[PDB]
Design a binder for this molecule. Structure first.
Ligand SMILES: [Mg+2]
Ligand SMILES: [Mg+2]
Ligand SMILES: [Mg+2]
Ligand SMILES: [Mg+2]
Ligand SMILES: [Mg+2]
Ligand SMILES: [Mg+2]
Ligand SMILES: [Mg+2]
Ligand SMILES: [Mg+2]
Ligand SMILES: [Mg+2]
Ligand SMILES: [Mg+2]
Ligand SMILES: [Mg+2]
Ligand SMILES: [Mg+2]
Ligand SMILES: [Mg+2]
Ligand SMILES: [Mg+2]
Ligand SMILES: [Mg+2]
Ligand SMILES: [Mg+2]
Ligand SMILES: [Mg+2]
Ligand SMILES: [Mg+2]
Ligand SMILES: [Mg+2]
Ligand SMILES: [Mg+2]
Ligand SMILES: [Mg+2]
Ligand SMILES: [Mg+2]
Ligand SMILES: [Mg+2]
Ligand SMILES: [Mg+2]
Ligand SMILES: [Mg+2]
Ligand SMILES: [Mg+2]
Ligand SMILES: [Mg+2]
Ligand SMILES: [Mg+2]
Ligand SMILES: [Mg+2]
Ligand SMILES: [Mg+2]
Ligand SMILES: [Mg+2]
Ligand SMILES: [Mg+2]
Ligand SMILES: [Mg+2]
Ligand SMILES: [Mg+2]
Ligand SMILES: [Mg+2]
Ligand SMILES: [Mg+2]
Ligand SMILES: [Mg+2]
Ligand SMILES: [Mg+2]
Ligand SMILES: [Mg+2]
Ligand SMILES: [Mg+2]
Ligand SMILES: [Mg+2]
Ligand SMILES: [Mg+2]
Ligand SMILES: [Mg+2]
Ligand SMILES: [Mg+2]
Ligand SMILES: [Mg+2]
Ligand SMILES: [Mg+2]
Ligand SMILES: [Mg+2]
Ligand SMILES: [Mg+2]
Ligand SMILES: [Mg+2]
Ligand SMILES: [Mg+2]
Ligand SMILES: [Mg+2]
Ligand SMILES: [Mg+2]
Ligand SMILES: [Mg+2]
Ligand SMILES: [Mg+2]
Ligand SMILES: [Mg+2]
Ligand SMILES: [Mg+2]
Ligand SMILES: [Mg+2]
Ligand SMILES: [Mg+2]
Ligand SMILES: [Mg+2]
Ligand SMILES: [Mg+2]
Ligand SMILES: [Mg+2]
Ligand SMILES: [Mg+2]
Ligand SMILES: [Mg+2]
Ligand SMILES: [Mg+2]
Ligand SMILES: [Mg+2]
Ligand SMILES: [Mg+2]
Ligand SMILES: [Mg+2]
Ligand SMILES: [Mg+2]
Ligand SMILES: [Mg+2]
Ligand SMILES: [Mg+2]
Ligand SMILES: [Mg+2]
Ligand SMILES: [Mg+2]
Ligand SMILES: [Mg+2]
Ligand SMILES: [Mg+2]
Ligand SMILES: [Mg+2]
Ligand SMILES: [Mg+2]
Ligand SMILES: [Mg+2]
Ligand SMILES: [Mg+2]
Ligand SMILES: [Mg+2]
Ligand SMILES: [Mg+2]
Ligand SMILES: [Mg+2]
Ligand SMILES: [Mg+2]
Ligand SMILES: [Mg+2]
Ligand SMILES: [Mg+2]
Ligand SMILES: [Mg+2]
Ligand SMILES: [Mg+2]
Ligand SMILES: [Mg+2]
Ligand SMILES: [Mg+2]
Ligand SMILES: [Mg+2]
Ligand SMILES: [Mg+2]
Ligand SMILES: [Mg+2]
Ligand SMILES: [Mg+2]
Ligand SMILES: [Mg+2]
Ligand SMILES: [Mg+2]
Ligand SMILES: [Mg+2]
Ligand SMILES: [Mg+2]
Ligand SMILES: [Mg+2]
Ligand SMILES: [Mg+2]
Ligand SMILES: [Mg+2]
Ligand SMILES: [Mg+2]
Ligand SMILES: [Mg+2]
Ligand SMILES: [Mg+2]
Ligand SMILES: [Mg+2]
Ligand SMILES: [Mg+2]
Ligand SMILES: [Mg+2]
Ligand SMILES: [Mg+2]
Ligand SMILES: [Mg+2]
Ligand SMILES: [Mg+2]
Ligand SMILES: [Mg+2]
Ligand SMILES: [Mg+2]
Ligand SMILES: [Mg+2]
Ligand SMILES: [Mg+2]
Ligand SMILES: [Mg+2]
Ligand SMILES: [Mg+2]
Ligand SMILES: [Mg+2]
Ligand SMILES: [Mg+2]
Ligand SMILES: [Mg+2]
Ligand SMILES: [Mg+2]
Ligand SMILES: [Mg+2]
Ligand SMILES: [Mg+2]
Ligand SMILES: [Mg+2]
Ligand SMILES: [Mg+2]
Ligand SMILES: [Mg+2]
Ligand SMILES: [Mg+2]
Ligand SMILES: [Mg+2]
Ligand SMILES: [Mg+2]
Ligand SMILES: [Mg+2]
Ligand SMILES: [Mg+2]
Ligand SMILES: [Mg+2]
Ligand SMILES: [Mg+2]
Ligand SMILES: [Mg+2]
Ligand SMILES: [Mg+2]
Ligand SMILES: [Mg+2]
Ligand SMILES: [Mg+2]
Ligand SMILES: [Mg+2]
Ligand SMILES: [Mg+2]
Ligand SMILES: [Mg+2]
Ligand SMILES: [Mg+2]
Ligand SMILES: [Mg+2]
Ligand SMILES: [Mg+2]
Ligand SMILES: [Mg+2]
Ligand SMILES: [Mg+2]
Ligand SMILES: [Mg+2]
Ligand SMILES: [Mg+2]
Ligand SMILES: [Mg+2]
Ligand SMILES: [Mg+2]
Ligand SMILES: [Mg+2]
Ligand SMILES: [Mg+2]
Ligand SMILES: [Mg+2]
Ligand SMILES: [Mg+2]
Ligand SMILES: [Mg+2]
Ligand SMILES: [Mg+2]
Ligand SMILES: [Mg+2]
Ligand SMILES: [Mg+2]
Ligand SMILES: [Mg+2]
Ligand SMILES: [Mg+2]
Ligand SMILES: [Mg+2]
Ligand SMILES: [Mg+2]
Ligand SMILES: [Mg+2]
Ligand SMILES: [Mg+2]
Ligand SMILES: [Mg+2]
Ligand SMILES: [Mg+2]
Ligand SMILES: [Mg+2]
Ligand SMILES: [Mg+2]
Ligand SMILES: [Mg+2]
Ligand SMILES: [Mg+2]
Ligand SMILES: [Mg+2]
Ligand SMILES: [Mg+2]
Ligand SMILES: [Mg+2]
Ligand SMILES: [Mg+2]
Ligand SMILES: [Zn+2]
Lengths: 112, 116, 151, 101, 140, 59
RNA sequence: GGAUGACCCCAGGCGGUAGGGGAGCGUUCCCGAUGCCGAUGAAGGCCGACCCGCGAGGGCGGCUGGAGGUAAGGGAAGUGC
RNA sequence: GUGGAGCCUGGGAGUGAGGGCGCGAGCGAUAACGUCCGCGUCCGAGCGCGGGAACAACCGAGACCGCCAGCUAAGGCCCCC
RNA sequence: CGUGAGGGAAAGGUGAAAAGAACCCCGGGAGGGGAGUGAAAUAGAGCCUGAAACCGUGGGCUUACAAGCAGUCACGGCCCCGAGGGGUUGUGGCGUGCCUAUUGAAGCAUGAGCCGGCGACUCACGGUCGUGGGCGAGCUUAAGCCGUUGAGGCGGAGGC
């Protein structure tokens, strides 16, 4: 049995969040929580909520035990980018892409 | 009436791109790069089909030569002896003989010396 | 095309390709090159060819034995059920498509709605319709004017 | 006991029980054929000069087929010369029945 | 029938007394032994030659005035980094390098020939430390 | 200066090779000897406010 | 050879830019079609180491897709990047 | 001498920047990867193949496709080969 | 956008029917997990199909003594599917991108970041050959008129 949670359209650049998501793949739920708590990155906040929300579903909807849960799989996909203008010198305009993430966490049970 | 590109072009590209599977980077992913690589690969094959026939013969000649010198004569002597003997067993088979059936090869070496 | 005739950006020195107006067929939304315009596809096929074609088309059916001439149309008076009666009676069960040619409007009205029947005034006889069909059925009055056109 | 035969411009070492692909032969499937012999070896050893007179190898023809398609492609740069030709080589499959020494 | 290919076989060890021999002419034979072209089952894409032990490398002999005139050369990549060492000195300082440098240039370039040169064990002076391998003495 | 510029697009392979050092090291944490919760060493425990065996801070 | 592009046998030609000629493939549309294929699944998409073709291509099978498609033979072009 | 020979009428072109090499000249300096003619050749279009370390035009040779068969050309046969 | 005359876009599709997802759970929300609707929910409104470039996760093979237009030919190792085949690549051989322009380009000469879609030899009238048919010392109508409503006929002025 698995349980998952997906935060879509998170306004942070995929490349940045993955750095944090990579930190908790294959970790026990307790270990991951410990890591995200003291990881000095903006992404840590977001990855945290998806982890908890996935753990929630595991205990609530899917008949799994919080004391067995580990991060079986986790990944960030990229969502639609938010394009914005950045005025440069000599009249030229640049286009900044404020990117977007779809964060997924999938939880499984470590029997024994 | 109008006949827009529609389906035709995507299909032509996929043919190529499937043929280019396994290649490095854009060569297996980009249609244009795939095509440039496939052109080279067509000429290489044709050329290497022709040269495979050479590549093996040279191996055969090296091997026949190795077994000949064990019996005190060289390849160039061995072949001439065979010609004078009128033996027409080819180099593909001579080499196989030289390794699998050494006593049979010995006999051929004998007739090669006898011929001159 | 609707757009302006202004040169969209200077000839040289921009680092972009050279262009004129955006109505140019190279642009999306621009004009088409050598596309269709209103056209008259008709032409004047030699009268002797047409005439000869009519004769030939009838002859081909006649040779097959698919051609039938009729003197009159018994009980048909403008009702489809009536034509079906007579049609059946003539060996026309609808298993073969029939071009019915007669000047009797009443007979044409009764038979026009059949899926397997094309109908024609004798002045309207033509090789397309003849070739399209499997059988040709003619009013003697029609067969008479047919004789006049190909004579 | 092995034999060395010669069919279709090429030479092969055959033993009974072996299946073999050679150039296409003009012979109905199921028929049997005698192949020329250049050398017999194993127990006795006889050296054909160039062929050995009394000896022949009897093979049954299992069938005829066409080899897997090779794409022979020709391209000349800066000239717009490109050629694509598909080639399947005909072949006949033999089963070596006996070696008539 | 597709051509025979040998599975890996136990490598033969060989011993050569280089004393009094002509440098270049002994070099070729060792290269040959290394390649394995003396074996009827030779295959060009695998290391299947002999291991070749050479002794008395310092006692190699050379014709003409090469002892004074043969200049071995090394480039360091720095400006003015071209070092010229004549044969006399090379024998006087690292004599086993003479047979080595010769044999190396007669082996094929690339990964394989590079590993074939590793199968060449050359020593100056009559003694070699491979008695464990029990090398077969060759006259060449 | 004359405005240096990349000569070729960086390949997906070379881009990713450059990033072989970009991996994060997980935070270094030890248990708090009072409340067993994990925390950075040499820092006053944010869970129970204990450091050096005594209460230092309200949490 | 047989009598005609029915297939077989023997022989010779077949590098190719500008360029001439020939034979085909596929795309949109019309006649064929008041027909035929189609929810027991149209088109389109993703596969295939299978089948036919020198090739352009055409089949067949699996997944997707969920309402269209369209033969033999002919016709006409906004017809192949 | 029956040849992708030749001649006649007609349809369709492309070309009208050539280049190396050998031999015969002019020009130049018995200079130029020079220049301008002549006869031939090859590259052009044979940047397809073997040789010349590599190298359009030097030597060998005109590549329809296939073969893990055979003979040779130039060039080669101590090792790389 | 432009002072102004003037220039001038992009942007269509859930489903048969909103039946447009009550309630519960994590979350500040966004989002998601169950429940429910539906024939179908990777039909969930950022909605038919959903190609490619591009980004990622997992798996198999492989790579830290090696010299490269990235392939190709041979052999071997490993993985897969069941005298065969598919994937992968260690070693060995061979190997100067595509296009354009040029006497000559891998060329340190032009163009091209990559992918998808738009994108260039047509039409009218006349001419000149060839060709498929009709009639042949003759051939043919034009505008129009009648008929049809995807029916054809008449019309001889004129032209060759
Ligand atoms: Mg950190
Ligand atoms: Mg909980
Ligand atoms: Mg400006
Ligand atoms: Mg950008
Ligand atoms: Mg940007
Ligand atoms: Mg299109
Ligand atoms: Mg295409
Ligand atoms: Mg397309
Ligand atoms: Mg497709
Ligand atoms: Mg296609
Ligand atoms: Mg690959
Ligand atoms: Mg491969
Ligand atoms: Mg790739
Ligand atoms: Mg890559
Ligand atoms: Mg890609
Ligand atoms: Mg190709
Ligand atoms: Mg070939
Ligand atoms: Mg070749
Ligand atoms: Mg040969
Ligand atoms: Mg050859
Ligand atoms: Mg070889
Ligand atoms: Mg000898
Ligand atoms: Mg000979
Ligand atoms: Mg021979
Ligand atoms: Mg306008
Ligand atoms: Mg306007
Ligand atoms: Mg204007
Ligand atoms: Mg103007
Ligand atoms: Mg204007
Ligand atoms: Mg630019
Ligand atoms: Mg640009
Ligand atoms: Mg401009
Ligand atoms: Mg323009
Ligand atoms: Mg305009
Ligand atoms: Mg528009
Ligand atoms: Mg338009
Ligand atoms: Mg428009
Ligand atoms: Mg257009
Ligand atoms: Mg135009
Ligand atoms: Mg037009
Ligand atoms: Mg009009
Ligand atoms: Mg016309
Ligand atoms: Mg008209
Ligand atoms: Mg009707
Ligand atoms: Mg009707
Ligand atoms: Mg009908
Ligand atoms: Mg009708
Ligand atoms: Mg033969
Ligand atoms: Mg067997
Ligand atoms: Mg054959
Ligand atoms: Mg075969
Ligand atoms: Mg070329
Ligand atoms: Mg080239
Ligand atoms: Mg090119
Ligand atoms: Mg050229
Ligand atoms: Mg080309
Ligand atoms: Mg020896
Ligand atoms: Mg010497
Ligand atoms: Mg030392
Ligand atoms: Mg080499
Ligand atoms: Mg400066
Ligand atoms: Mg400067
Ligand atoms: Mg600078
Ligand atoms: Mg400055
Ligand atoms: Mg700069
Ligand atoms: Mg640059
Ligand atoms: Mg990239
Ligand atoms: Mg990657
Ligand atoms: Mg890098
Ligand atoms: Mg810290
Ligand atoms: Mg507290
Ligand atoms: Mg022939
Ligand atoms: Mg030829
Ligand atoms: Mg040709
Ligand atoms: Mg030209
Ligand atoms: Mg022709
Ligand atoms: Mg097409
Ligand atoms: Mg067509
Ligand atoms: Mg219809
Ligand atoms: Mg219909
Ligand atoms: Mg049905
Ligand atoms: Mg259904
Ligand atoms: Mg289905
Ligand atoms: Mg369609
Ligand atoms: Mg297909
Ligand atoms: Mg379905
Ligand atoms: Mg389908
Ligand atoms: Mg409908
Ligand atoms: Mg279709
Ligand atoms: Mg149709
Ligand atoms: Mg058709
Ligand atoms: Mg028709
Ligand atoms: Mg039209
Ligand atoms: Mg067009
Ligand atoms: Mg000719
Ligand atoms: Mg000629
Ligand atoms: Mg002419
Ligand atoms: Mg023409
Ligand atoms: Mg033309
Ligand atoms: Mg010109
Ligand atoms: Mg001129
Ligand atoms: Mg001129
Ligand atoms: Mg000139
Ligand atoms: Mg000139
Ligand atoms: Mg001379
Ligand atoms: Mg001269
Ligand atoms: Mg002069
Ligand atoms: Mg002088
Ligand atoms: Mg010159
Ligand atoms: Mg000169
Ligand atoms: Mg001169
Ligand atoms: Mg000349
Ligand atoms: Mg030219
Ligand atoms: Mg050449
Ligand atoms: Mg020529
Ligand atoms: Mg060469
Ligand atoms: Mg050459
Ligand atoms: Mg060479
Ligand atoms: Mg070369
Ligand atoms: Mg050259
Ligand atoms: Mg030169
Ligand atoms: Mg020979
Ligand atoms: Mg010679
Ligand atoms: Mg040499
Ligand atoms: Mg010699
Ligand atoms: Mg070397
Ligand atoms: Mg050799
Ligand atoms: Mg203004
Ligand atoms: Mg304004
Ligand atoms: Mg304007
Ligand atoms: Mg626009
Ligand atoms: Mg709808
Ligand atoms: Mg609707
Ligand atoms: Mg709440
Ligand atoms: Mg709550
Ligand atoms: Mg708040
Ligand atoms: Mg919600
Ligand atoms: Mg959730
Ligand atoms: Mg929900
Ligand atoms: Mg249900
Ligand atoms: Mg159903
Ligand atoms: Mg789906
Ligand atoms: Mg759907
Ligand atoms: Mg969708
Ligand atoms: Mg729909
Ligand atoms: Mg999507
Ligand atoms: Mg995709
Ligand atoms: Mg991976
Ligand atoms: Mg090293
Ligand atoms: Mg290694
Ligand atoms: Mg392999
Ligand atoms: Mg395999
Ligand atoms: Mg390789
Ligand atoms: Mg070159
Ligand atoms: Mg190309
Ligand atoms: Mg130019
Ligand atoms: Mg130029
Ligand atoms: Mg020039
Ligand atoms: Mg280059
Ligand atoms: Mg370039
Ligand atoms: Mg470059
Ligand atoms: Mg230029
Ligand atoms: Mg260009
Ligand atoms: Mg750009
Ligand atoms: Mg790309
Ligand atoms: Mg034209
Ligand atoms: Mg005409
Ligand atoms: Mg006529
Ligand atoms: Mg008339
Ligand atoms: Mg006139
Ligand atoms: Zn604490």
């Amino acid at each position: 049995m698995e349980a998952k949670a997906i935060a879509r359209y998170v306004r942070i650049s995929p490349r940045k969040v993955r750095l944090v998501v990579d930190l908790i793949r294959g970790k026990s739920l307790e270990e991951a929580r410990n890591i995200l708590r003291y990881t000095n990155k903006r992404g840590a906040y977001f990855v945290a909520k998806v982890l908890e929300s996935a753990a929630a579903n595991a205990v609530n909807n899917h008949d799994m035990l919080e004391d067995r849960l580990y991060v079986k799989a986790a990944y960030v996909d990229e969502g639609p980018a938010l394009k914005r203008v950045l005025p440069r010198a000599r009249g030229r305009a640049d286009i900044i892409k404020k990117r977007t993430s779809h964060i997924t966490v999938i939880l499984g049970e470590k029997h024994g | 009436p109008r006949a827009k590109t529609g389906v035709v072009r995507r299909r032509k590209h996929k043919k190529i791109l499937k043929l280019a599977k396994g290649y490095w980077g854009l060569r297996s992913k980009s249609f244009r790069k795939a095509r440039e690589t496939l052109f080279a690969a067509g000429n290489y094959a044709y050329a290497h089909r022709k040269r495979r026939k050479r590549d093996f013969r040279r191996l055969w000649i090296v091997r026949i030569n190795a077994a000949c010198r064990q019996h005190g004569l060289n390849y160039s002597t061995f072949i001439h002896g065979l010609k004078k003997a009128g033996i027409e067993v080819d180099r593909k088979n001579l080499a196989d003989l030289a390794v699998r059936e050494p006593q049979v090869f010995a006999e051929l070496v004998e007739r090669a010396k006898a011929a001159q | 095309v609707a757009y302006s005739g202004r040169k969209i950006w200077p000839q040289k020195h921009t680092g972009r390709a050279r262009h004129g107006d955006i109505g140019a067929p190279i642009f999306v939304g621009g004009g088409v090159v050598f596309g269709p315009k209103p056209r008259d596809y008709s032409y004047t096929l030699p009268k002797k060819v047409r005439k000869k074609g009519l004769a030939m088309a009838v002859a081909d059916r006649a040779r097959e034995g698919k051609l039938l001439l009729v003197e009159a149309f018994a009980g048909v008076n403008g009702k489809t059920k009536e034509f079906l009666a007579w049609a059946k009676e003539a060996g026309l069960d609808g298993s073969e498509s029939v071009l019915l040619v007669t000047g009797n409007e009443l007979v044409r009205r009764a038979a026009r709605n059949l899926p397997w029947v094309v109908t024609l005034a004798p002045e309207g006889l033509n090789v397309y319709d003849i070739v399209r069909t499997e059988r040709l059925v003619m009013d003697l009055d029609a067969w008479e004017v047919f004789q006049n056109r190909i004579g | 006991m092995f034999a060395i035969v010669k069919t279709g411009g090429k030479q092969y070492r055959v033993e009974p029980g072996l299946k073999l692909r050679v150039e296409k032969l003009d012979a109905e499937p199921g028929a049997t054929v005698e192949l020329p012999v250049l050398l017999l070896g194993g127990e006795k050893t006889v050296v054909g000069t160039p062929v050995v007179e009394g000896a022949s190898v009897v093979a049954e023809v299992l069938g005829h087929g066409r080899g897997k398609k090779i794409l022979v492609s020709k391209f000349k740069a800066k000239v717009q010369y490109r050629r694509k030709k598909g080639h399947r080589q005909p072949y006949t499959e033999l089963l070596i029945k006996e070696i008539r020494g | 029938m597709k051509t025979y290919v040998p599975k890996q076989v136990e490598p033969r060890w060989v011993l050569i007394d280089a004393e009094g021999k002509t440098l270049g002419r002994l070099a070729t034979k060792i290269a040959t032994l290394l390649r394995g072209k003396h074996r009827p089952d030779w295959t060009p894409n695998v290391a299947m030659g002999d291991f070749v032990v050479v002794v008395n490398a310092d006692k190699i002999r050379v014709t003409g005035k090469k002892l004074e005139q043969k200049i071995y050369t090394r480039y360091s990549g720095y400006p003015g980094g071209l070092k010229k060492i004549p044969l006399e000195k090379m024998l006087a300082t690292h004599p086993e390098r003479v047979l080595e440098h010769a044999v190396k240039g007669m082996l094929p370039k690339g990964p394989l020939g590079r590993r074939l040169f590793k199968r060449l064990k050359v020593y100056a002076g009559p003694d070699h430390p491979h008695q464990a391998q029990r090398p077969e003495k060759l006259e060449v | 200066a004359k405005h240096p510029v990349p000569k070729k697009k960086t390949s997906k392979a070379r881009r990713d090779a450059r990033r072989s050092h970009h991996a994060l090291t997980p935070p270094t944490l030890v248990p708090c000897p009072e409340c067993k919760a994990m925390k950075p060493p040499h820092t006053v425990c944010p869970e129970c406010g204990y450091y050096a065996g005594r209460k230092v801070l309200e949490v």
